[PDB]
Amino acid sequence: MEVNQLGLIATALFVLVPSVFLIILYVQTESQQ
Amino acid sequence: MEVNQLGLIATALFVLVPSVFLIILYVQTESQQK
Amino acid sequence: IPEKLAFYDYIGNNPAKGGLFRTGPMNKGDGIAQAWKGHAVFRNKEGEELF
Amino acid sequence: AELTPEVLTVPLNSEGKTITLTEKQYLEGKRLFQYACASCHVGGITKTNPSLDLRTETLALATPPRDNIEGLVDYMKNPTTYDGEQEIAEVHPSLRSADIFPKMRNLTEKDLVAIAGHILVEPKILGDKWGGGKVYY
Amino acid sequence: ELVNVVDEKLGTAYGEKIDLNNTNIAAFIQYRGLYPTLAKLIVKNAPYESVEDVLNIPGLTERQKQILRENLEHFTVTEVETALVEGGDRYNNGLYK
Amino acid sequence: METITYVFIFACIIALFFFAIFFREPPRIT
Amino acid sequence: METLKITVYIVVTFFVLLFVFGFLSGDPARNPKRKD
Amino acid sequence: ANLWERFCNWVTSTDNRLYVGWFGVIMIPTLLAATICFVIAFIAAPPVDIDGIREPVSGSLLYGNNIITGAVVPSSNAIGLHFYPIWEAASLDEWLYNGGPYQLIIFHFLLGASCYMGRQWELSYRLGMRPWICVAYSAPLASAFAVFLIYPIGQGSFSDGMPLGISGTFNFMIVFQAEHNILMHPFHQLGVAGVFGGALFCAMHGSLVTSSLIRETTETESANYGYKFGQEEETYNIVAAHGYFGRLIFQYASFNNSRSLHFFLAAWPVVGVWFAALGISTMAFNLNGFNFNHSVIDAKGNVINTWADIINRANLGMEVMHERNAHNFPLDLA
Amino acid sequence: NPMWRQGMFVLPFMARLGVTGSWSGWSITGETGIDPGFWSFEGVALAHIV
Amino acid sequence: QTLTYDDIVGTGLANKCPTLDDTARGAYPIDSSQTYRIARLCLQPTTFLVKEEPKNKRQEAEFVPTKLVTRETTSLDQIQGELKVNSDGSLTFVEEDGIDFQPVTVQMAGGERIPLLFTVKNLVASTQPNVTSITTSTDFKGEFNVPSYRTANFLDPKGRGLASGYDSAIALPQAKEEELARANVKRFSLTKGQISLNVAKVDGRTGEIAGTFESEQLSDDDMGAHEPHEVKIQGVFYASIEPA
Numbered sequence A: 001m002e003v004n005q006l007g008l009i010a011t012a013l014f015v016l017v018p019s020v021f022l023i024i025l026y027v028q029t030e031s032q033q
Numbered sequence B: 001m002e003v004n005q006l007g008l009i010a011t012a013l014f015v016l017v018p019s020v021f022l023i024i025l026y027v028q029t030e031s032q033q034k
Numbered sequence C: 001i002p003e004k005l006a007f008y009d010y011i012g013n014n015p016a017k018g019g020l021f022r023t024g025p026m027n028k029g030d031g032i033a034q035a036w037k038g039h040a041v042f043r044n045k046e047g048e049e050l051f
Numbered sequence D: 001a002e003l004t005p006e007v008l009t010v011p012l013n014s015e016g017k018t019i020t021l022t023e024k025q026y027l028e029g030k031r032l033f034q035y036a037c038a039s040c041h042v043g044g045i046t047k048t049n050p051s052l053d054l055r056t057e058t059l060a061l062a063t064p065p066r067d068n069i070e071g072l073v074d075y076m077k078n079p080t081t082y083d084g085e086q087e088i089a090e091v092h093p094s095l096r097s098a099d100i101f102p103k104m105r106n107l108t109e110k111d112l113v114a115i116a117g118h119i120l121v122e123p124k125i126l127g128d129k130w131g132g133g134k135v136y137y
Numbered sequence E: 001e002l003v004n005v006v007d008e009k010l011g012t013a014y015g016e017k018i019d020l021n022n023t024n025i026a027a028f029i030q031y032r033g034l035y036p037t038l039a040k041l042i043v044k045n046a047p048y049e050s051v052e053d054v055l056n057i058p059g060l061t062e063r064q065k066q067i068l069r070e071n072l073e074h075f076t077v078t079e080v081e082t083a084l085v086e087g088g089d090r091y092n093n094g095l096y097k
Numbered sequence F: 001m002e003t004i005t006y007v008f009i010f011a012c013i014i015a016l017f018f019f020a021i022f023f024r025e026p027p028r029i030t
Numbered sequence G: 001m002e003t004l005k006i007t008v009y010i011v012v013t014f015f016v017l018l019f020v021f022g023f024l025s026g027d028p029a030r031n032p033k034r035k036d
Numbered sequence H: 001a002n003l004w005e006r007f008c009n010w011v012t013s014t015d016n017r018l019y020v021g022w023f024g025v026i027m028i029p030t031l032l033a034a035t036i037c038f039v040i041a042f043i044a045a046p047p048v049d050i051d052g053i054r055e056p057v058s059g060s061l062l063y064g065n066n067i068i069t070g071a072v073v074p075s076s077n078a079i080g081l082h083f084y085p086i087w088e089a090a091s092l093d094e095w096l097y098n099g100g101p102y103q104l105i106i107f108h109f110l111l112g113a114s115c116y117m118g119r120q121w122e123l124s125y126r127l128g129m130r131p132w133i134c135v136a137y138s139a140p141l142a143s144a145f146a147v148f149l150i151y152p153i154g155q156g157s158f159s160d161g162m163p164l165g166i167s168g169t170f171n172f173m174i175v176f177q178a179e180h181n182i183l184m185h186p187f188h189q190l191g192v193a194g195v196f197g198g199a200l201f202c203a204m205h206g207s208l209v210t211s212s213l214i215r216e217t218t219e220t221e222s223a224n225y226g227y228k229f230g231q232e233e234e235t236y237n238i239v240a241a242h243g244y245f246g247r248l249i250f251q252y253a254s255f256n257n258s259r260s261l262h263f264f265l266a267a268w269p270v271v272g273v274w275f276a277a278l279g280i281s282t283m284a285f286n287l288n289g290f291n292f293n294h295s296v297i298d299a300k301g302n303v304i305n306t307w308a309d310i311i312n313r314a315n316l317g318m319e320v321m322h323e324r325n326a327h328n329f330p331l332d333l334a
Numbered sequence I: 001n002p003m004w005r006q007g008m009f010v011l012p013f014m015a016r017l018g019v020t021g022s023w024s025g026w027s028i029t030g031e032t033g034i035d036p037g038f039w040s041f042e043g044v045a046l047a048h049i050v
Numbered sequence J: 001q002t003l004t005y006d007d008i009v010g011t012g013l014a015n016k017c018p019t020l021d022d023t024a025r026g027a028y029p030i031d032s033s034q035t036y037r038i039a040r041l042c043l044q045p046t047t048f049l050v051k052e053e054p055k056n057k058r059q060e061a062e063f064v065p066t067k068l069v070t071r072e073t074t075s076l077d078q079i080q081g082e083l084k085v086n087s088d089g090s091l092t093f094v095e096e097d098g099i100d101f102q103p104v105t106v107q108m109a110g111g112e113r114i115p116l117l118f119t120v121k122n123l124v125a126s127t128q129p130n131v132t133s134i135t136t137s138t139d140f141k142g143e144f145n146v147p148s149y150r151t152a153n154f155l156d157p158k159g160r161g162l163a164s165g166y167d168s169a170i171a172l173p174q175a176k177e178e179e180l181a182r183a184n185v186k187r188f189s190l191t192k193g194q195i196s197l198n199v200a201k202v203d204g205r206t207g208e209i210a211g212t213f214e215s216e217q218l219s220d221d222d223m224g225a226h227e228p229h230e231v232k233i234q235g236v237f238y239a240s241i242e243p244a
């Protein structure tokens, strides 16, 4: 299928950037006293 | 220039996955009791 | 001569002809092989076979 | 716009005599057409044979001509194929076949005239919608 | 080049008259006396080299022959087009109202 | 590539279901 | 196909029998209040 | 101490992380079978001749679909309502061509979801709860029965069951409107009132309780920390909430009784969706929406169109185009 | 166009030990209409996922 | 001992041609003065083979087995027509009517689906000369027509067709048309097929014959969108011959 070549990087960053934002916040919450 | 179309995602993930690994470890180090 | 035998006698199937960042299948390089063209015999004007 | 005597004036016979129906007759014709005919001829088409419709121009080219009261009344007594060659009372409702089409059993001569007048007046109201089918809904 | 043979046929006499060799049978309703009896015979005994050949259908009554003669001016013949005559399409071409 | 991407996201969601159910923060009465 | 059919019939019968015999096994009394 | 006694105790145990129970004994294998077949078919099944006219429709990701267009395609119109399990096909290749996966999925799903509903009764009994959560769930479940089973029965074919996919769902909706004028059916209108109203009252209840939370936290903490799981005191002031909403409208239009309030919140969407399901399930037998086509007529007899006639024109466009190669005769009678 | 022209990496290891056929009817030696049983390339893959 | 619809329904027997006993090794006399017809011809395919399309184009392509995916819907039956006695004693069957086609889809190894219109439409088939009696040595050989698998009204998934439909790719309003011409301009196929009938059993008393057939024809070309494949069909046949 002739899909948009930028679809992959768009989907990958759309998932990864906010997901890693949440993981960063979660992990530093767990590590608090 | 007719570059490899997977070059972009490969470079992006190459930067972001290990960088994010380090940022996670640093921030949860800073937040530990001092 | 079987096409398969002739195809082994071709450098594009030699595993020492590649490159570290030339990725993917061999077909991505020289193409998807379709048919043997046959054996080429070269001759000069005198008619001697040349190799 | 109104349902006037002129709208209700339709050809009586093939010779060019006209007849002017009453509004009562028009109402009777719609009622009786729905009672006995609309199940196949709703809107002036023919559900079981869409090649033949009830447009006045189609009826005029039928054999014998059916674009007048006498032709339509005769059709309801002894219906024929479009070319007049075959009598079809055995598969089309008629006074002749009231035994197998029981809704024809109580239709009087007066009723047939009213149904015929409905078939002729309605295209004068609806134009190409009559006999047009779903394209014109 | 690639050509739609039905559209092409519309540029011949098929687009102007009833083609005795191709036209679907419902078209004979356009004129008095042709449908269904003569129309069935016409389609069943097609194709025809010329329009007048329709008069050679065996079994016709004299009135039937007279009806054909009066309507020859509305008939034409073109080469049989496979796409118009396969699938029983001359008897039912999938068009209703 | 698209198919891999769609199935990957789906697979992550199913994994998320597993952790959200079996490795949830346990409800505690305090 | 024949083996597949027989296998599924056996599987279905097993679970259906579990269901019926399970609810026959004193189900009213399996509550936290009155033992019926 | 006997194995069947011990097994019954584990099956009906209130201490399993996920309750099993006797309905669960049917639910778990049937839902796993439907889930596994659905996932594999959605990814990899070849095209399916849904309308029985040797015109296979591609549903799977590997055969050119994305998440929005992909589907598990209903079984062939040639099958109709015939039972088409795997062992009825000469081969898996035939089974796939004819839409076998669809029947396997929907039959296992409908059985499993019915057992899901019984399981809701069962656990509530084991926990000493009142029993009617399962009655609330009967509304979505009846809706699933309507589009996967009852509508196919009425029309004579699982090829008219709702497809298992996003665009296939829209296809079912548009054809349904063409053939039943569902928008003009009062049970679908009650359905809309049910889900619009459910959404409205959801936002309403949410906002009113949130508005009257008792102060228990500081400016920097989430107010959610003001509630502790299992505390005996209510966490909001319903007298304040009612005092607000009774003044928004008038006093008697507002609930001060939490039990009455929450009963209303249960009943309104459940009743409405019941009527939605009955809408599909009775249009399954072709009792269709109101038909006011050509209802308004002037003094001469000219049709005066209304908005119903414009709806009709849109319905006609759907009608004449749908399944463009499947109809040979002038009426679409099923 | 054998597997090694196509960048296939695990396909040769399945074939090396006797998995040569597909449930879809082909074999890697070019046959048609073979029944590999369950232990086709697809069956091997399914077994590893489970 | 006579079966009814309810004896047969759902069994698959409805797609099977009649058979004759092993004792049916007789001879049916042909009177060159009598006219005859085939009252019923039945053709039951037992194997579909599709010719492989190799790349080399100098290797001999073979017919390979295929998997039928459209179920027990394949047989031709109730076929009838004139059975002429020619001056040289040969017989010629001229097909006139019957259930003389079936759409069929078979699948190659690897999944490629091959639809075809399995047919003997307009069959004309002749025996060898001097057939004074039809016996187990009689053969029929002939040709038939293979019309387009879809007829002229058929619309593709984007609404394009021959006697109906759009004549362009309307979802690509400003694309160049030349590259889409083969998909946009629908064409109606008409080709020839060949068939041989080998009589294996003859009931002289009843005029019934049965045997094996092999036929060869092209498959669906999707109204000209792609090249058809060559198909070989093998099976059994039954025919009842009658004085007419």
Ligand code: CLA
Binding pocket: C020, C021, C022, C023, C024, C025, I006, I007, I008, I009
């Ligand atoms: C033993 C490992 C191995 C081997 C020998 C192969 C072999 C093959 N693969 Mg497979 N693959 C593998 C593992 C392997 N794979 C894994 C783990 C995955 C999941 C990611 C895949 C997914 C995969 C896909 C999706 C595809 C292949 C394909 C192929 C074929 C072409 C490969 C190619 O172009 O590489 C090119 C090689 C490189 C570009 C080399 C990378 C060099 C790295 C980046 C160096 C990094 C340096 C590092 C950052 C420095 C650290 C320094 C610090 C310590 C200071 C070839 C037959 C292709 C094929 O044709 O399939 C039919 C294909 O499409 N493979």
Ligand code: CLA
Binding pocket: G008, G009, G011, G012, G013, G015, G016, G017, G019, G020, H025, H026, H027, H029, H030, H033, H083, H084, H085, H086, H087, H103, H104, H105, H107, H108, H111
């Ligand atoms: C709880 C377990 C369970 C249940 C209820 C079902 C049910 C079904 N399966 Mg599934 N299946 C299961 C597990 C189950 N399956 C598992 C674990 C596998 C993997 C091996 C499969 C693999 C499978 C395949 C591959 C297929 C099915 C199919 C079916 C359907 C046809 C079954 C049939 O003909 O049985 C007939 C058996 C009987 C009639 C005997 C029952 C005997 C009992 C004791 C008598 C009482 C019956 C009566 C209704 C009483 C019920 C009591 C109740 C009212 C309280 C049916 C929806 C087929 C399908 O989906 O076709 C569309 C199909 O092709 N199943």
Ligand code: CLA
Binding pocket: H188, H189, H190, H192, H193, H194, H196, H197, H200
């Ligand atoms: C512009 C504002 C507006 C209004 C006033 C309505 C009103 C209505 N819609 Mg419509 N609708 C709208 C916009 C609107 N819609 C838009 C933008 C869309 C998308 C295009 C739709 C799509 C839509 C569909 C598909 C349907 C409706 C339906 C309805 C009816 C039921 C609605 C319902 O239960 O909601 C939920 C709200 C409640 C449950 C709360 C109460 C709502 C009632 C009607 C208010 C009564 C107030 C009272 C008369 C005031 C008196 C005061 C005094 C006595 C104190 C109702 C007549 C249905 C219908 O046509 O039924 C015949 C239906 O099927 N709507």
Ligand code: CLA
Binding pocket: H113, H139, H140, H141, H142, H143, H144, H146, H147, H172, H173, H174, H176, H177, H182, H183, H188, H191, H192, H195, H196, H273, H276, H277, H278, H279, H280
């Ligand atoms: C604003 C406009 C509007 C609105 C509000 C509605 C509203 C509705 N439509 Mg109507 N419709 C519209 C316009 C509209 N429509 C138009 C323009 C058309 C013509 C094109 C239609 C034609 C139409 C049709 C043909 C149908 C609807 C139906 C409905 C109802 C759908 C919701 C439902 O079925 O819940 C019920 C709940 C469910 C269906 C969910 C079942 C869930 C099961 C039990 C469990 C599933 C589990 C799942 C697989 C896994 C969970 C996740 C996992 C992690 C656990 C709802 C009343 C449907 C209906 O009434 O169904 C009865 C229906 O069939 N509409």
Ligand code: CLA
Binding pocket: I010, I011, I013, I014, I017, I019, I044, I048
């Ligand atoms: C459970 C049984 C089982 C079976 C029957 C298979 C079968 C297969 N595997 Mg799978 N696999 C399994 C479990 C299994 N696997 C497990 C548990 C894993 C995760 C570790 C894998 C991960 C895996 C991968 C990554 C791959 C396979 C592949 C394959 C295929 C090729 C086999 C091969 O070349 O191995 C060759 C095995 C060896 C050469 C083993 C070397 C043994 C060393 C030398 C032993 C040295 C230590 C020993 C103690 C020394 C002393 C010995 C003493 C006798 C003197 C074949 C279908 C291949 C494939 O086709 O994938 C699709 C492939 O690439 N498997």
Ligand SMILES: CCCCCCCCCCCCCCCC(=O)OC[C@H](CO[C@@H]1O[C@H](CS(=O)(=O)O)[C@@H](O)[C@H](O)[C@H]1O)OC(=O)CCCCCCCCCCCCCCC
Binding pocket: H010, H016, H017, H018, H019, H020, H027, H028, H031, H032, H035, I050
């Ligand atoms: C191809 C097959 C190959 C065969 C090889 C062997 C296969 C064995 C497979 C076993 C897999 C075990 C997984 C256990 C996971 C688990 O739930 O454990 C969690 C708990 C803990 O087990 C608890 O375990 C306890 C003991 S212990 O902790 O495990 O040691 C025990 O005391 C307690 O009673 C028990 O409930 O188990 C339960 O809560 C009860 C069973 C719940 C099962 C739910 C299935 C739901 C399916 C829903 C429908 C499909 C939905 C699909 C996607 C939405």
Ligand code: HEC
Binding pocket: D033, D036, D037, D038, D039, D040, D041, D046, D048, D049, D052, D053, D054, D055, D058, D059, D062, D066, D072, D075, D076, D080, D081, D082, D088, D092, D093, D115
């Ligand atoms: C379906 C069961 C019908 C009912 C009820 C009625 N008619 Fe009909 N009509 C029907 C068919 C199939 C045909 C064509 C028959 C043929 O082979 O020619 C017709 C035709 C007519 C016509 C002739 C139309 C024309 O010449 O263009 C007329 C005038 C007509 N029908 C009138 C009519 C009346 C008055 C009816 C009720 C009393 C009635 N029809 C019922 C099918 C059916």
Ligand SMILES: CCCCCCCCCCCCO[C@@H]1O[C@H](CO)[C@@H](O[C@H]2O[C@H](CO)[C@@H](O)[C@H](O)[C@H]2O)[C@H](O)[C@H]1O
Binding pocket: G020, G021, G024, G025, G026, G027, H004, H005, H006, H008, H009
């Ligand atoms: C559809 C096919 C099945 C139809 C079956 C019709 C059955 C009609 C007669 C039922 C006989 C009763 O048999 C019933 O089953 C099981 C196994 O014997 C018994 O055994 C059970 O006893 C106790 C009851 O509290 C349970 O806790 C325990 O798990 C179990 O061992 C039930 O106590 C008995 O009441």
Ligand SMILES: CCCCCCCS[C@@H]1O[C@H](CO)[C@@H](O)[C@H](O)[C@H]1O
Binding pocket: I035, I036, I037, I038, I039
């Ligand atoms: C998890 C899915 C299990 C499906 C099992 C498919 C069995 S397939 C079946 O069994 C044998 C395979 O070894 C063969 O001998 C046999 O010919 C084959 O048809």
Ligand SMILES: CCCCCCCS[C@@H]1O[C@H](CO)[C@@H](O)[C@H](O)[C@H]1O
Binding pocket: H040, H044, I022, I023, I024, I042, I045, I046, J110, J111, J112
């Ligand atoms: C582990 C589950 C396996 C799911 C995929 C099984 C399909 S089998 C699949 O079929 C295709 C079409 O017939 C072929 O082209 C392909 O070669 C073959 O691998």
Ligand SMILES: O=C1C=C(Br)C(=O)C=C1Br
Binding pocket: H201, H204, H205, H206, H208, H209, H238, H241, H242, H245, H246, H253, H254, H255, H256, H261
């Ligand atoms: O959710 C609600 C809460 C209160 Br309080 C009320 O009066 C009405 C509604 Br709806």
Ligand SMILES: O=C1C=C(Br)C(=O)C=C1Br
Binding pocket: H190, H191, H193, H194, H267, H268, H269, H271, H272
């Ligand atoms: O219209 C409605 C009336 C009541 Br009461 C209900 O419960 C749901 C809907 Br929708």
Ligand code: OEX
Binding pocket: H051, H077, H155, H159, H160, H175, H179, H322, H323, H326, H332, H333, H334
């Ligand atoms: O199939 Mn699905 O859709 Ca119920 O209507 Mn008839 O069929 Mn078909 O057309 Mn319209």
Ligand SMILES: [Ca+2]
Binding pocket: J136, J137, J138, J198, J199, J200
């Ligand atoms: Ca012989």
Ligand SMILES: [Cl-]
Binding pocket: H171, H175, H321, H322, H323, H324
């Ligand atoms: Cl559609």
Ligand SMILES: [Cl-]
Binding pocket: H326, H327, H328, H329
């Ligand atoms: Cl139809």
